Each structure stands twice: as structure tokens, then as C-alpha cells.
mmCIF file of C-alpha atoms and ligand atoms in Angstrom:
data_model
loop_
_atom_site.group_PDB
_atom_site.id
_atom_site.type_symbol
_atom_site.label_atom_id
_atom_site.label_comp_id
_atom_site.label_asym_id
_atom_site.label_seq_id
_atom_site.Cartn_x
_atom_site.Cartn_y
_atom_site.Cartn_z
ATOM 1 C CA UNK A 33 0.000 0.000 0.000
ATOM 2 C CA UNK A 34 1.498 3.441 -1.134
ATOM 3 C CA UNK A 35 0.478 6.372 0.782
ATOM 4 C CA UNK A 36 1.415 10.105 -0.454
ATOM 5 C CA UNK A 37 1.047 13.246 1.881
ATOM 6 C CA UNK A 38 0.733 16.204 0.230
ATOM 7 C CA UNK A 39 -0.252 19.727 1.007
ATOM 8 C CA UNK A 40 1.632 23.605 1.552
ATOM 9 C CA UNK A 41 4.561 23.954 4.089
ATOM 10 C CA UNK A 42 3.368 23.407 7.854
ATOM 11 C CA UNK A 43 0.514 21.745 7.034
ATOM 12 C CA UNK A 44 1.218 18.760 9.726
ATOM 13 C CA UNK A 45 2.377 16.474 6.754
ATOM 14 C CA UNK A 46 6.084 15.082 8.625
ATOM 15 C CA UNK A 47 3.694 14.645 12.229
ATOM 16 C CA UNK A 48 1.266 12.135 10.396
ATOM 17 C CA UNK A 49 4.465 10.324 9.796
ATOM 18 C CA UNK A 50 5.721 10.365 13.138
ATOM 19 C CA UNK A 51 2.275 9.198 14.763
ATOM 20 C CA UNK A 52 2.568 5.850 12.625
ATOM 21 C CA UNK A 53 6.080 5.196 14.826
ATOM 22 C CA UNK A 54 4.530 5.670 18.235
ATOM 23 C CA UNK A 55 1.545 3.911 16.982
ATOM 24 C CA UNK A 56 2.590 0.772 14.974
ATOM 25 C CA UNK A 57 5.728 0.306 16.639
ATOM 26 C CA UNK A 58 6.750 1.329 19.678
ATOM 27 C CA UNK A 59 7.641 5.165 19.888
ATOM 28 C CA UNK A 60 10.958 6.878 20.153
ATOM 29 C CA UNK A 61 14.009 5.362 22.156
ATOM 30 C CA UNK A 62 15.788 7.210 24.443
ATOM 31 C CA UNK A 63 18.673 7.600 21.452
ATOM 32 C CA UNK A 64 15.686 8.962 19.151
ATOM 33 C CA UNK A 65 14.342 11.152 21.336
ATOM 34 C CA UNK A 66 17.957 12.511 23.098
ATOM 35 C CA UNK A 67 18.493 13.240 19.170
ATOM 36 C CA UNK A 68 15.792 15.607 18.974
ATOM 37 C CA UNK A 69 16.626 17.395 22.526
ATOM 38 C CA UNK A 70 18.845 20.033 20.079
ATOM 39 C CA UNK A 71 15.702 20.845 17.827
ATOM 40 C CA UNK A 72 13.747 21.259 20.970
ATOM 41 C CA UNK A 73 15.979 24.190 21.790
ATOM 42 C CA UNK A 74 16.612 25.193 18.472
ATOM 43 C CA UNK A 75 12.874 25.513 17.779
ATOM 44 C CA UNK A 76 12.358 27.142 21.383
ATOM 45 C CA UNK A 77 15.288 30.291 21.076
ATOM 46 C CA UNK A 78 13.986 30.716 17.733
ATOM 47 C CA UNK A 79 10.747 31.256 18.490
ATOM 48 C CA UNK A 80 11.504 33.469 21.619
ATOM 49 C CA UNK A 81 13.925 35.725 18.866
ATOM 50 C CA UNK A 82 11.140 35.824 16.319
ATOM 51 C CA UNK A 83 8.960 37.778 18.928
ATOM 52 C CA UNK A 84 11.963 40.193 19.708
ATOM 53 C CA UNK A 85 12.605 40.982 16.156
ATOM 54 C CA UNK A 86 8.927 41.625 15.862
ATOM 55 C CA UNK A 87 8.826 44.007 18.617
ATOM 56 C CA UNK A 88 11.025 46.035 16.593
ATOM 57 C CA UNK A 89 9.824 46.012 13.448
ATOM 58 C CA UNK A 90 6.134 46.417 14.980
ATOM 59 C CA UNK A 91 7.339 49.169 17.594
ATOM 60 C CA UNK A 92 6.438 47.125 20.913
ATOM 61 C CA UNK A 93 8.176 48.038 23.950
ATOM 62 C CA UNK A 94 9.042 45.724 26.646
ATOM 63 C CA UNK A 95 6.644 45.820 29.977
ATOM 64 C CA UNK A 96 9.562 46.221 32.296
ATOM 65 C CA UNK A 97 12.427 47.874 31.139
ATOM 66 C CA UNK A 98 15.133 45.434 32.864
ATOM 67 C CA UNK A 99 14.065 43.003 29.748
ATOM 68 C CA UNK A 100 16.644 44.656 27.623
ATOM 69 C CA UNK A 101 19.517 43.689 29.484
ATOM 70 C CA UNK A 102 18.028 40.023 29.401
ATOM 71 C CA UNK A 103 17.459 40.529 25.676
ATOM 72 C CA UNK A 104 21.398 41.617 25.479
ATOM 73 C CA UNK A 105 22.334 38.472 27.355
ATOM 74 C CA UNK A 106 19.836 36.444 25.565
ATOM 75 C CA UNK A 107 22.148 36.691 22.088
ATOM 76 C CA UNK A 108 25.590 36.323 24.290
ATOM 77 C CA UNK A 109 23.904 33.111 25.696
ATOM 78 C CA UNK A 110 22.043 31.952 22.589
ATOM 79 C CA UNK A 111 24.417 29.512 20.805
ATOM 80 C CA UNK A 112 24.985 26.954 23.488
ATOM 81 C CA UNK A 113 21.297 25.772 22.845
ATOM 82 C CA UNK A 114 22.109 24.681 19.362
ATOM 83 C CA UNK A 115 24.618 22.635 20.532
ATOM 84 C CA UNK A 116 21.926 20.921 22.708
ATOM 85 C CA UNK A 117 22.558 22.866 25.758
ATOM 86 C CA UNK A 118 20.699 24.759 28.182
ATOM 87 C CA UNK A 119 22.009 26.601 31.046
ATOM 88 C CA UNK A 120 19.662 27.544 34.276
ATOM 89 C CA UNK A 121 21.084 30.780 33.113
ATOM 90 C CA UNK A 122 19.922 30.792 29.589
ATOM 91 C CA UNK A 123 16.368 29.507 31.042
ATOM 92 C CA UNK A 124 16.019 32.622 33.015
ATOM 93 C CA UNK A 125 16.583 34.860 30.548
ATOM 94 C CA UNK A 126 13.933 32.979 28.460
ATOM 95 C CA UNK A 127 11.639 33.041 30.929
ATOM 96 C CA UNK A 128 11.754 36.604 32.378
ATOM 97 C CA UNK A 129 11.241 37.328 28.264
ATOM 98 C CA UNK A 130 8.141 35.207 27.579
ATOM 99 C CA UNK A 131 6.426 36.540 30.420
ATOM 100 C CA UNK A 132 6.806 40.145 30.171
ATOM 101 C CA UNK A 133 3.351 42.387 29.235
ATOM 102 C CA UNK A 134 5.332 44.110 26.285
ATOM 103 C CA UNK A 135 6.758 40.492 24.433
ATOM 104 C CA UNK A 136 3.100 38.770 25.365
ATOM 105 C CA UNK A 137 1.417 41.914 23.530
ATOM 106 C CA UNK A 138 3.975 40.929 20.537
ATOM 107 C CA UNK A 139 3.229 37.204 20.589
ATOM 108 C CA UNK A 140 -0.543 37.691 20.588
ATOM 109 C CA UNK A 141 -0.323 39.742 17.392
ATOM 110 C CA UNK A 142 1.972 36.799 15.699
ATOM 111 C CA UNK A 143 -0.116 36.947 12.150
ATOM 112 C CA UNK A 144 1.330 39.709 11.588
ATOM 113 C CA UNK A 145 4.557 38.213 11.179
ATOM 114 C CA UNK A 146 6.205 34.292 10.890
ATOM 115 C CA UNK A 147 5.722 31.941 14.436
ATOM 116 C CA UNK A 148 6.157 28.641 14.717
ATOM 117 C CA UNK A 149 2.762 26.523 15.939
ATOM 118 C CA UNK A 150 4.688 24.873 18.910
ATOM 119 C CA UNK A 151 6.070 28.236 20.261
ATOM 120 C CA UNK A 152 3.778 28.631 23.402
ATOM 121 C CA UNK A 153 4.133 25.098 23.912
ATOM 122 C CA UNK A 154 7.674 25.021 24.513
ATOM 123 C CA UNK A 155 8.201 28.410 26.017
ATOM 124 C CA UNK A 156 5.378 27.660 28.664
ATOM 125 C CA UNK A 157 7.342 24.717 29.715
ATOM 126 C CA UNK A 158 10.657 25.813 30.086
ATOM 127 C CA UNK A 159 11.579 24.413 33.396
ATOM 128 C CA UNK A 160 10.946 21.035 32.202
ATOM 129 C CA UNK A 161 12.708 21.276 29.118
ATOM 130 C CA UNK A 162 15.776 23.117 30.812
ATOM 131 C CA UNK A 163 16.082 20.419 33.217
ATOM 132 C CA UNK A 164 19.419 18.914 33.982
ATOM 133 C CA UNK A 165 19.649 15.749 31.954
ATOM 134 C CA UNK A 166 16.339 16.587 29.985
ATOM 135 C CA UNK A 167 15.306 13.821 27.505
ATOM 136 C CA UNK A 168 12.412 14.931 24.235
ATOM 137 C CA UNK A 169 9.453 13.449 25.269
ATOM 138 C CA UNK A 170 6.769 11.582 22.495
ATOM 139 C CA UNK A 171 4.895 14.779 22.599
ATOM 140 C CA UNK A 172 8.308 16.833 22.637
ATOM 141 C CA UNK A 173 9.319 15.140 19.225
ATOM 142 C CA UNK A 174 5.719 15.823 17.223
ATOM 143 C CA UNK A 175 5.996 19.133 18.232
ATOM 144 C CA UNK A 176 9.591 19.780 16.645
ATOM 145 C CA UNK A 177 9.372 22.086 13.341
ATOM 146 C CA UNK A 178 12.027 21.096 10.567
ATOM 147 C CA UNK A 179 11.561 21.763 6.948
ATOM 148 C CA UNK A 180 11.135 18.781 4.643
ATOM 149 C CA UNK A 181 13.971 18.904 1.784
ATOM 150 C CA UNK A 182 14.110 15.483 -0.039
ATOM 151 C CA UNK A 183 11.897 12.535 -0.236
ATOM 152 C CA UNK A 184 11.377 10.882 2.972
ATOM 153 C CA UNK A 185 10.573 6.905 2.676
ATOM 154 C CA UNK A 186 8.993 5.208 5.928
ATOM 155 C CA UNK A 187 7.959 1.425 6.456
ATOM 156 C CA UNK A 188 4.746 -0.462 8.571
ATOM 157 C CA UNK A 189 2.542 -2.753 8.923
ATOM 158 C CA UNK A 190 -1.002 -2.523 9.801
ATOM 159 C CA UNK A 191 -3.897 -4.923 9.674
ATOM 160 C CA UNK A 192 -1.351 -7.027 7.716
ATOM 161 C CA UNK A 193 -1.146 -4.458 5.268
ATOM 162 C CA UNK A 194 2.802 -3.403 4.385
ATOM 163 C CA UNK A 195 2.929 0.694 4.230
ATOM 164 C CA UNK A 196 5.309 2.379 2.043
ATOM 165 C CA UNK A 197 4.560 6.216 2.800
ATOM 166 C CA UNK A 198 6.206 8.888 0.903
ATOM 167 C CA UNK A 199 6.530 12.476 2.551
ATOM 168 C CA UNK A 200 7.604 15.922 0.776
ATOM 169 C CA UNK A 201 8.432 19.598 1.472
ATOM 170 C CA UNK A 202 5.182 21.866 0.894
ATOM 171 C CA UNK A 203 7.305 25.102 0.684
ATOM 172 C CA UNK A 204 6.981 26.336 -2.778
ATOM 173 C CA UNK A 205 10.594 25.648 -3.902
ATOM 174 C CA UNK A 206 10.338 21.602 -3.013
ATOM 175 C CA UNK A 207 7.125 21.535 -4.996
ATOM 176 C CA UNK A 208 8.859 20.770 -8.483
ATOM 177 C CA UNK A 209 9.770 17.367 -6.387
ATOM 178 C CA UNK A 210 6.299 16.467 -5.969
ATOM 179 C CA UNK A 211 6.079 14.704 -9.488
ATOM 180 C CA UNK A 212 8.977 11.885 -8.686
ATOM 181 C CA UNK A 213 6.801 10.622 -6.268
ATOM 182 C CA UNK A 214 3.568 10.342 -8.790
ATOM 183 C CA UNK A 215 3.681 6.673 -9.570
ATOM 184 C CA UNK A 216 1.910 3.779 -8.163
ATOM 185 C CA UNK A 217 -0.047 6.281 -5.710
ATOM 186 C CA UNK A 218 -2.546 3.751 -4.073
ATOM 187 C CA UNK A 219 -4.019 6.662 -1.753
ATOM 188 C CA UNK A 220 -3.164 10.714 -0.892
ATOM 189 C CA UNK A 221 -3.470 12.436 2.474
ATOM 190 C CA UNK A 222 -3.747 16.017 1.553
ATOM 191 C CA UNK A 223 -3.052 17.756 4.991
ATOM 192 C CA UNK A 224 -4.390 21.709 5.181
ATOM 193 C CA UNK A 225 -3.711 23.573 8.354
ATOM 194 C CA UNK A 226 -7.690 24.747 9.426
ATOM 195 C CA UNK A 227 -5.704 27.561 11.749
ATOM 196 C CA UNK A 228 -3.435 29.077 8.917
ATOM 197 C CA UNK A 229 -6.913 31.400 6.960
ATOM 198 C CA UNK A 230 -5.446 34.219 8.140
ATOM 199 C CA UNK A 231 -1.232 33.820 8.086
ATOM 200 C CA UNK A 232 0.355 34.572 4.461
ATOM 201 C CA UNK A 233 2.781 32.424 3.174
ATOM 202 C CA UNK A 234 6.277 32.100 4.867
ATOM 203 C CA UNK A 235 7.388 32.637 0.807
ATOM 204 C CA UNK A 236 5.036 35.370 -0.238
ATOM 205 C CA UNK A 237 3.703 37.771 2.460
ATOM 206 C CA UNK A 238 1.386 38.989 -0.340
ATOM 207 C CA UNK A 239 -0.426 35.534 -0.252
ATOM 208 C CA UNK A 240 -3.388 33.991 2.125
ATOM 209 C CA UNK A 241 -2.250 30.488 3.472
ATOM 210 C CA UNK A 242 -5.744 28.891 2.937
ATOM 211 C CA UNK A 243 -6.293 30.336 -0.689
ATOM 212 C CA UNK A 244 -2.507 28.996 -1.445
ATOM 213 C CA UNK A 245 -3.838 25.387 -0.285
ATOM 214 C CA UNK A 246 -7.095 26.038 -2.077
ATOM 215 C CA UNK A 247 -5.217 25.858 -5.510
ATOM 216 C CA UNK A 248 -2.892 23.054 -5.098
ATOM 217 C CA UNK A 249 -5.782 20.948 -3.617
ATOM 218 C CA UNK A 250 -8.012 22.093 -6.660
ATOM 219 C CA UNK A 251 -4.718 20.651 -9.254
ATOM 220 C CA UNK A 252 -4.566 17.469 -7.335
ATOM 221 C CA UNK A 253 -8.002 16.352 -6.927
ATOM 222 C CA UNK A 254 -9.015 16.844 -10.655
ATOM 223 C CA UNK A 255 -5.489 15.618 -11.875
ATOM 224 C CA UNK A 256 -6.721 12.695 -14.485
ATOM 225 C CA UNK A 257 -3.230 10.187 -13.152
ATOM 226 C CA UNK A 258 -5.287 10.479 -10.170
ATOM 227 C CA UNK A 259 -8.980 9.296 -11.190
ATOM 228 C CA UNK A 260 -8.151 5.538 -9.582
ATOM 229 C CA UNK A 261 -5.971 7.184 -6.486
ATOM 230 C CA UNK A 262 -8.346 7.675 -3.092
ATOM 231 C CA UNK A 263 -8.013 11.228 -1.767
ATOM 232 C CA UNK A 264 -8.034 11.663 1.470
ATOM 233 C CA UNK A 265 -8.467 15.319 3.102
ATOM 234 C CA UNK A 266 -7.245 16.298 6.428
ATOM 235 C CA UNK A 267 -8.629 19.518 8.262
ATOM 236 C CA UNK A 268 -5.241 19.481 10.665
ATOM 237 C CA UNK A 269 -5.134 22.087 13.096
ATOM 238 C CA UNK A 270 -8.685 21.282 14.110
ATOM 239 C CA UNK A 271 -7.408 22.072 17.826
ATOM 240 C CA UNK A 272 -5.470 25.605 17.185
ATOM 241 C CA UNK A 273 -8.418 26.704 14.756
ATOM 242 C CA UNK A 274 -11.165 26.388 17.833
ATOM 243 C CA UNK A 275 -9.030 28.726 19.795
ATOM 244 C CA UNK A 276 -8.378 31.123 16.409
ATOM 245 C CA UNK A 277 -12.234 31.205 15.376
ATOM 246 C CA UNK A 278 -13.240 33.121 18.841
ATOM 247 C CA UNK A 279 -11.377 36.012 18.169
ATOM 248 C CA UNK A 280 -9.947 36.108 14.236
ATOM 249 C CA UNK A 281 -12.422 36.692 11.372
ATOM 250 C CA UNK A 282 -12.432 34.195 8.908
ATOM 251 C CA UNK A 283 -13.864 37.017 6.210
ATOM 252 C CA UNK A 284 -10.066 37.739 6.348
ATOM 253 C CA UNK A 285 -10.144 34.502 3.888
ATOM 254 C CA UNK A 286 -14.061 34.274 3.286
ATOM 255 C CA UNK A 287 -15.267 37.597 3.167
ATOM 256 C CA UNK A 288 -18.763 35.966 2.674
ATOM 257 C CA UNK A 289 -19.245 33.981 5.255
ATOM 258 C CA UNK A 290 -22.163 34.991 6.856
ATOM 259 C CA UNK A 291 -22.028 32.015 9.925
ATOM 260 C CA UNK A 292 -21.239 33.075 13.182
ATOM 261 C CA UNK A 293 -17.440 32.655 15.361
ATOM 262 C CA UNK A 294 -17.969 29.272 15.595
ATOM 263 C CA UNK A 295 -16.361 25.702 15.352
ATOM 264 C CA UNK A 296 -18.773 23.438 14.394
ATOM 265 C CA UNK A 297 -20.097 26.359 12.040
ATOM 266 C CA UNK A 298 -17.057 27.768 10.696
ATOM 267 C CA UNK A 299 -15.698 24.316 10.080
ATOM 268 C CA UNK A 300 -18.084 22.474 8.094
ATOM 269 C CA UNK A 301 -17.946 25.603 5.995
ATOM 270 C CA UNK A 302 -14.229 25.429 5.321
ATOM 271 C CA UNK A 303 -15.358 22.026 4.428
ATOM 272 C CA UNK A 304 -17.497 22.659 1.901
ATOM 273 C CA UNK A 305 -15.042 25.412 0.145
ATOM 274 C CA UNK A 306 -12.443 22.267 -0.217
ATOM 275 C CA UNK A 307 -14.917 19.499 -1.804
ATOM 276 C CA UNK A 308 -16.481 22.149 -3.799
ATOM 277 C CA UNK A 309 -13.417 22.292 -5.717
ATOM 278 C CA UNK A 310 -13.798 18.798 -7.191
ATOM 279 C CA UNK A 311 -14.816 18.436 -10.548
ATOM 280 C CA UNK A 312 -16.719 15.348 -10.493
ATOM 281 C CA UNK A 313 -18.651 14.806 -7.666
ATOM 282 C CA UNK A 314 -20.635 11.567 -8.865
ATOM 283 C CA UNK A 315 -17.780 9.817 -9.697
ATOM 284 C CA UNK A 316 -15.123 10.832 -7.736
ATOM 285 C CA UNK A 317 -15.414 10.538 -3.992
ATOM 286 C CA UNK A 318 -12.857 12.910 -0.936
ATOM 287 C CA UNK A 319 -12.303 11.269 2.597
ATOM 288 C CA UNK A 320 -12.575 14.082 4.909
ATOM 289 C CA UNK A 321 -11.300 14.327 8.188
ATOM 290 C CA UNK A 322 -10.669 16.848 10.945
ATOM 291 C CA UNK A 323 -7.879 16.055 12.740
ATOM 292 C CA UNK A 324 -5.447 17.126 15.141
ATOM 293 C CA UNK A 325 -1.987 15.564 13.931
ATOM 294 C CA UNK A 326 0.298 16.432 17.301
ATOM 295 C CA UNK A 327 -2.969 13.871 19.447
ATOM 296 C CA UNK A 328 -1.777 10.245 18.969
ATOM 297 C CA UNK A 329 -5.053 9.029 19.704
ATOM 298 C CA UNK A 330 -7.179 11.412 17.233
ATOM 299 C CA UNK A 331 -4.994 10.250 14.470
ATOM 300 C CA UNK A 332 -5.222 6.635 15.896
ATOM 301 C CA UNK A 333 -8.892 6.285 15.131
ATOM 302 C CA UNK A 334 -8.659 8.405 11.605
ATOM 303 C CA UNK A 335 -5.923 6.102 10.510
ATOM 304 C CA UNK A 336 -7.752 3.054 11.585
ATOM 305 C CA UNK A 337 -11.009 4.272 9.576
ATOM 306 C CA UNK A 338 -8.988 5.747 6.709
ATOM 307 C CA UNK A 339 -7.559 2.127 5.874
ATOM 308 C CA UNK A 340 -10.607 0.579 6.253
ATOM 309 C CA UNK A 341 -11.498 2.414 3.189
ATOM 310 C CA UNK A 342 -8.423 0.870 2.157
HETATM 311 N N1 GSP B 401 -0.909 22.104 17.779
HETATM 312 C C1 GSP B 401 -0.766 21.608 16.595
HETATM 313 N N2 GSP B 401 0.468 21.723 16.035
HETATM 314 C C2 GSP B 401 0.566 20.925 14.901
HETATM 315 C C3 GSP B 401 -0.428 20.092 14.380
HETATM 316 N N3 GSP B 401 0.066 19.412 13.217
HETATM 317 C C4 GSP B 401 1.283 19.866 13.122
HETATM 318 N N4 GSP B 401 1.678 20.754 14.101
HETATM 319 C C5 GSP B 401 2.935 21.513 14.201
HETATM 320 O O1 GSP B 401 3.157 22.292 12.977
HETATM 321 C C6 GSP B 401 4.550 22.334 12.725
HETATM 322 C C7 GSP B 401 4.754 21.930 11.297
HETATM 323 O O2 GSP B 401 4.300 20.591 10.990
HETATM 324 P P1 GSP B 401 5.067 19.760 9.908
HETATM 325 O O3 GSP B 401 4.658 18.373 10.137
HETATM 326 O O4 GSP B 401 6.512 20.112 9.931
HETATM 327 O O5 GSP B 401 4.489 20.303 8.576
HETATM 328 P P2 GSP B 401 4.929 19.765 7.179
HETATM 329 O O6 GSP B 401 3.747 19.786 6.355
HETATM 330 O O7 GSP B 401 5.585 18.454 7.349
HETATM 331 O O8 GSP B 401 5.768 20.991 6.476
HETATM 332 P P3 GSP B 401 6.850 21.115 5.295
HETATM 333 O O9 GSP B 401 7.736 19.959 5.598
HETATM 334 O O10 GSP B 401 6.129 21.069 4.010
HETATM 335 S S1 GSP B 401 7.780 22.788 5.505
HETATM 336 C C8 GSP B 401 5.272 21.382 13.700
HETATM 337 O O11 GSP B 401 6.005 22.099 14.746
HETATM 338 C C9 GSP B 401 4.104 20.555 14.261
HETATM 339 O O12 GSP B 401 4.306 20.121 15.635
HETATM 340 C C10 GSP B 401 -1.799 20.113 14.993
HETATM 341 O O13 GSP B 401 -2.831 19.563 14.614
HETATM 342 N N5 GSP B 401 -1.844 20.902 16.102
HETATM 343 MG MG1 MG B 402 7.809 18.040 6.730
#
């Protein structure tokens, strides 16, 4: 059985993969997941330097003004963490940062610039992850953020079915790649992030995540090699989008939705915009699912259902 995930950059497309580890076999190892502990902080002083640069650029002042000697240090300190280190020191700095009134102010305005999902994740747990022999746990290691370059080949079985699934970068300049992986496709997961209607691409700041999706979903579903292929479509994200619907309009991407701030509302409708775009609707069927791609036990039960259409 040949899988293909496809979809734009950060659309939860390398997590998938890693679920079908922890769920068909057996997790990380402590020599997996000690391999990851350098992302972890990579992902984490990236993330707390994103919001500083922003501050900047969007004139935000700290809350208390002692922050910018812990912003100096912060850069003296930084490249330890890289090297998978992270001083007590270095955690304090961090810390004092992420919870001052001026850098929160900057982080809750983060469409307006390029964040990582995971950010508050990490940053809110920084005494854990600073810890004195700290070791990535399962959740630490779905949460990591690394760009796919390449074609990424993983192996396992399930329901005595033998996987082969393929994996690809969504950022615009791996998409010429796509097309080496076209053959022998016996079903595509087409991930699209439900939270990213109102980010612009990482490549474009010009461009509306969701629309971006709207047209590469649109060219795969109605691509003729595909007609025998099963298409599956995952609404990832389903867990940051319920938080993003209460307070961010989605007529920043639908200007005519007329439904109300809603989940259950604002999610079907998203829905409907994706299936709309395929051209033959009485003979050619989309497996929808909502799903949130970091919960091993949402994408569990999807993955058990989506092979039974298998
Ligand atoms: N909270 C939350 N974070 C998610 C979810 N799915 C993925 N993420 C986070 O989004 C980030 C990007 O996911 P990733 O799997 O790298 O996207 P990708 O499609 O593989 O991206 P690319 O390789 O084309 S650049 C990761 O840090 C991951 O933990 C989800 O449903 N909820
Ligand atoms: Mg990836």
C-alpha cells in the first residue's frame, strides 16, 4: 500500500508520519528522542527571537524595562542551545522574556509576522525542558518544526497491510519534487492547516495560506493520473483553529461567510469550500477528516477508519 502526503509547508504532513512510529511500533528510544533534545531548543530560542525581532519592526516596547539587558544576554547566551545545551542561566533569561506584558502583547499579534505553531508550547514549559539531563518526550518530538527537503521513505505494517509512505516539502521551492513521487499512488493524504486562513505564506507575504492550499488541492483532486488514487483530506489544526475562530475573522479569507465565530459552524464551511473544488462529484469521492496531527489518539482512530477504506 502506497500512501502520499501532500499539502503547503506546515501543514502537519512530517507529524502524520511520526504518529505511525509511536503507533505501529513502539515510539521513540531514548537515542531517538535525546536526538531531537537540540531541535527542541533550536525551535524554542527561535521562536523566543522571532517575537523580539517583531517588537522592533512592529514598535512594541518591553513591559519592564530590565528586559533589555536580558534581551542583550539572551544573544551572548544563545548559541549553546544549538549545541543541545541549556544553562539555568539561559532559562532565566527565556523566561523573564516570555512573560513580560510588552513580548506577550507581541506574541498575541503573531499573524502579523512568521511563528512557529509549537512556540507557546515550549516556552510555557521551560523548566521542564531546561532540566538537567532533559530527555524529548513523544509529545516533545511531534511538536519539533524542521523543513522537509528530499523525499522521505517510511515502512509499517497494519492490519497485515505493508505501508510504504512517501513524505515531501510543501514550501513552494520543493514543490517541483512532488512529481517523482507520482507513480503507483494507491491513496493521498492532503493535509491543510484549518488555523493558517489568516497567516500569508512564509514565501510570499502577499499571499493567504488557505487560498494557497485552495489551488494546489483544486490541481490534485481533478489531476486525471489520479482518477483511480483515493483522496483523502485532512482539516489538521482542528485544535489551534477552535481557539483562532473566537477572536480572528475568517472574512479575512471568506469575506462571505455569513455564519457566526464558531467551530462546528465555521468548520463544516471550510469544508465545503475544499470538496467544492472537485470536478466530479458523482464519480469521484474525498475522505474528509478533521484532525489534530500532534494527538496520537485522534490520528489513531482516523488512521484506523482511513484504511478501512483501504
Ligand atoms: N498544535 C498543533 N500543532 C501541529 C499540528 N500538526 C502539526 N503541528 C505543528 O506544525 C509544525 C509543522 O508541521 P510539519 O509536520 O513540519 O508540517 P509539514 O507539512 O511536514 O511541512 P513542510 O515539511 O512542508 S515545511 C510542527 O512544529 C508541528 O508540531 C496540529 O494539529 N496541532
Ligand atoms: Mg515536513
Amino acid at each position: 500500500v502506497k500512501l502520499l502526503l501532500l499539502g503547503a509547508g506546515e501543514s502537519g504532513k512530517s507529524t502524520i508520519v511520526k504518529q505511525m512510529k509511536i503507533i505501529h511500533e513502539a515510539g521513540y528510544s531514548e537515542e531517538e528522542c535525546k536526538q531531537y533534545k537540540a531541535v527542541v531548543y533550536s525551535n524554542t530560542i527561535q521562536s523566543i527571537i522571532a517575537i523580539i525581532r517583531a517588537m522592533g519592526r512592529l514598535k512594541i516596547d518591553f513591559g519592564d524595562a530590565a528586559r533589555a539587558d536580558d534581551a542583550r544576554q539572551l544573544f551572548v547566551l544563545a548559541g549553546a542551545a544549538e549545541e543541545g545545551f541549556m544553562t539555568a542561566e539561559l532559562a532565566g533569561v527565556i523566561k523573564r522574556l516570555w512573560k513580560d506584558s510588552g513580548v506577550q502583547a507581541c506574541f498575541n499579534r503573531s499573524r502579523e509576522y512568521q511563528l512557529n505553531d509549537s512556540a507557546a508550547y515550549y516556552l510555557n514549559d521551560l523548566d521542564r525542558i531546561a532540566q538537567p539531563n532533559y530527555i524529548p518526550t513523544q509529545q516533545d518530538v511531534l511538536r519539533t518544526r524542521v523543513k522537509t527537503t528530499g523525499i522521505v521513505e517510511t515502512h509499517f505494517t497494519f492490519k497485515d497491510l505493508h505501508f510504504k509512505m512517501f513524505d515531501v516539502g510543501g514550501l513552494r521551492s520543493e514543490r517541483k519534487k512532488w512529481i517523482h513521487c507520482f507513480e503507483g499512488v494507491t491513496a493521498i493524504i492532503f493535509c491543510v492547516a484549518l488555523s493558517d486562513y489568516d497567516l500569508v505564506l512564509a514565501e510570499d507575504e502577499e499571499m493567504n495560506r488557505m487560498h494557497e492550499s485552495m489551488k494546489l488541492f483544486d490541481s490534485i483532486c481533478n489531476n486525471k493520473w489520479f482518477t483511480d488514487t483515493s483522496i483523502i483530506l485532512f482539516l489538521n489544526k482542528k485544535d489551534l483553529f477552535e481557539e483562532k475562530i473566537k477572536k480572528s475573522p475568517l472574512t479575512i479569507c471568506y469575506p462571505e461567510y455569513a455564519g457566526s465565530n464558531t467551530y462546528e459552524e465555521a468548520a463544516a464551511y471550510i469544508q465545503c469550500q475544499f470538496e467544492d473544488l472537485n470536478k466530479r462529484k458523482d464519480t469521484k469521492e474525498i475522505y474528509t477528516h478533521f484532525t489534530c496531527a500532534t494527538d496520537t489518539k485522534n490520528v489513531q482512530f482516523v488512521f484506523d477508519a482511513v484504511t478501512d477504506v483501504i
